[PDB]
Amino acid sequence: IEGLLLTEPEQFEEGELEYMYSAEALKKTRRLRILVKEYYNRGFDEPVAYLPNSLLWLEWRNYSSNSFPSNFEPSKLVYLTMKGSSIIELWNGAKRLAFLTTLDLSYCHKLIQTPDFRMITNLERLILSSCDALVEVHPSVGFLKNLILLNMDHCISLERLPAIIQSECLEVLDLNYCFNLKMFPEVERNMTHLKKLDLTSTGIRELPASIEHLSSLENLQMHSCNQLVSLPSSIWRFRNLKISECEKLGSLPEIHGNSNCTRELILKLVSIKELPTSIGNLTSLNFLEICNCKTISSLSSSIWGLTSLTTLKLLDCRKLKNLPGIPLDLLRIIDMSWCSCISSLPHNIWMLKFLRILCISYCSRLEYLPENLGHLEHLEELLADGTGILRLPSSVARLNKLEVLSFRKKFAIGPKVQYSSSMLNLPDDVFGSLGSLGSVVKLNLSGNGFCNLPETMNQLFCLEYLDITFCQRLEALPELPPSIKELYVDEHLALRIMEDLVIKCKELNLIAVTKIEYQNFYRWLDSIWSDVSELLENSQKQQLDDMLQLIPFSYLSTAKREEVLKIVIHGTRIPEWFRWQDRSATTMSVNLPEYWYTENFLGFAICCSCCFYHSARSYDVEFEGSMHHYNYDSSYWKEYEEPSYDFYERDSIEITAKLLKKVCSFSMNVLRRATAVPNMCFAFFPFYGIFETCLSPGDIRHRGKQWGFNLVYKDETGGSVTHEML
């Protein structure tokens, strides 16, 4: 026959399929090379007991009882694959297989031991997957001189590999999710030819000193390794190192000076007290990130000799104290976030320049920032999210290259926001530091209690993004630059500003209106769905109607702008000025009438009801859901740290209007205390068909439930549309 491929069993229905592989049938063969069983057994099987000694290519699924036939000595084979179970003790031992190359055993759920490898060589692929009860790998496997793909996946009970790996050309070595290993094998020679070394979720104790050979990989990623406590110095011979989620490390290997090449250093969720204090010998680093280490109290000594580092990131360094101080010329990136324990910054940084990226985020215990900042004329991004810095440092007007300036303060949400002793009755009149600046693109101010503004704002140019978020005690905005695309303002003075500046400002795209009362009404999470105080909407429902009534409508002229008019406001109901309301179905479909051009038709005004979420809402709902049962203990709460979360977020939605294709996106601010609030969103797009507006294929959290639609017209914005639908 010379070839047999057993097809699906649901085609005979008499038992011929069992007959073909039955012992009496294979006698007539006398020559057979390939035998594949690609069909899984439905409910029944017949044990095979011949196994003629002539095969070369064999694939079996759901094999019969444990052992192979005792007379199976093929003396020649190439390819063996088993997807079955209960195949313990493949051979009695010392089996002479000369030509066998490929050995694959997948999901053999009770294989207790591999056969002997004293004779068989030239084994190119050895694959073992999902072997649940396997505690030994027959270290003779490590003596093969030609091994290419060693796969060991989901080995629950794996304990020891061969102690020595003698292979000279090993390409793929995968050890995945073992989490029960004891020691990585020590290699002898150099594997110049190697592609993949996977070591994932393994319960190793420490790497041996022979890892320098594996320096042919130049990368080392370690994730969720929860058993190792030390590393060899040879790991320093790697170009990229990324260590994450090691609950107990305690130390880092001392630098021996043998390696001079390493540029990528990433450390996460690690217990590293201090650095080895000899980092300068590497003199090749480019990127250093330390993220959320609970015990990083002392960083290092003389770290500033790394020969012009480039990227320095320190996140969630809850206990990292005052920095040693600079005694570098290619430093672009300095990020420090949520460093609570730091009290001040070293002064000598005002010598350092060519920085251009400085972020201080949510550092509460930092007040006296550096003041001189002389000849620091290269900064471009400056972020200040934490408290402490009450007054901006003097001589800040010397620099003239800043483009992004963020200044956020944290307050307490209640019936009325109260500033910190009214900013310690700060002289708000003399505030002119930001006025003296120039060429500023993004300017964010929130939580600052200033009554007056600089009068030189006209000189300042290209201020594309302007945010004044929860800034009360303010009477009026004196003068605004003519190039503000995005404006975020409080509801206290919002009606005047838009009708006063949209007609004048040529490029004013998006206006966001924020009200504290609507913010603090949803302080509890349950308030979004449980019930709503009716009168509150009547506090702002007519606010939207009068705002819509007071709008200059001159967008039907030539296209000065490629963008449309976008307004975001609080609220959860139609302002009733729309004559076409849809309750449900999370979709819109309006069959507008025809012959609109009797009078010039300005455009379609569309309204949507949505609600934006804080990025951390899942944590609060999960926390309170667990609180509904509260199986915790008193000792648990003594060392519980609340996971640091940003107090401000920018949430956006995307909508598309189809009848020409026009797609535009919304945005507004969301606070930490008030995770989700409902918002009204108005869009106006100046100009047979059916008006349609779906949100997006994605937008998992965002649906939108209410819609409105009218046709606006000429004759002093009459809007007397002949549309009667509901």
Binding site: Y40, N41, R42, G43, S106, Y107, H109, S130, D132, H154, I156, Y177, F179, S201, G203, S224, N226, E247, K248, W524, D526, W529, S615, S618, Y619, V621, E622, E624, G625, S626, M627, H628, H629, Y630, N631, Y632, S634, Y636, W637, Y640, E642, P697, G698, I700, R701, R703
Partner: protein, 353 residues
Amino acid sequence: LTPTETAVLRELRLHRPPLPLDTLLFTDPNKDPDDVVTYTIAKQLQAEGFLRLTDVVVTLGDADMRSQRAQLAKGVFDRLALPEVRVARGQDYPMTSTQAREHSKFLAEGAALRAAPDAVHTDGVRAMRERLATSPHKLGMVVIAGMTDASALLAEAGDLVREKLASITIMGGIDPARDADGLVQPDTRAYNNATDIHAARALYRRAQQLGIPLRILSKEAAYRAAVPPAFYEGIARNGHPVGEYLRDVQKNALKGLWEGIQANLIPGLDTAWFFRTFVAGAMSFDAIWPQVTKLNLYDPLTLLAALPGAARLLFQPTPMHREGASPVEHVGHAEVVRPEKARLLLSALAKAA
């Protein structure tokens, strides 16, 4: 006993399916009064022909811990007139020291509920593989526990597991960000997803790549469908050992919380917060207990959503899959349209059994 609960129960009777559905269940019993409610309502549904429980799997512990959990589950099932379901232990999964400490939880009230220490079976998903292979019809899978064994089951014989399964119902969460390949990944904050993140990711990816429909329930469904405390007293009025057990555990947990919130031991919570989400100075608990109306049941809603017969009666799934992808949809707080009938079903199909 109330006329409206009988009316909605007979409505559910009229809405019966033609063929019972065999379901595979993964639970972590004796940690909260929720999984026992799920068992009770599953038994009562089976007596009505809606479903038919075959096997159960225990998780969230060490070898001895999971053995004890399976023993208690077998005892509860035996005393619930369910002497057919097979109890099977799980398989080992990686643990951190903090995770091990919080996963070694075992309330003392469940010590007596353990059955004879020989009827338990400690193989795993080996039996479920055979039944899944030889089942003459399609089955549904419900996950309300760790995803380790569930991930193990779907990692082998893709064609078999896609050709003899209907859908998967899980109580968990959805990460707001899409995957690199456009798939949907579980979030890190959900308790079931945080039990073993790798297994959860593997389950979600395999289910979405194999064409099996996915049912996901959030945590706010219980918020929309809270239950009054008179349910516990009603079920325990007749001296049922199981009902007594749930009443005792709920009382213990609630008074532990009420004593902990006093003297501001727990940060971020105060006396005002307790009276907000549990009601609408500091007296004895015996007077606080009557004025509660918003207790939560999480996993029973997942079982209710699993059955297509009752899925259309009160839920309204929201599709979220990409146009080219396997059908996956999420049911949250906005999808529950009739919470009153939901509470009625919980009270009815939990009180009768």
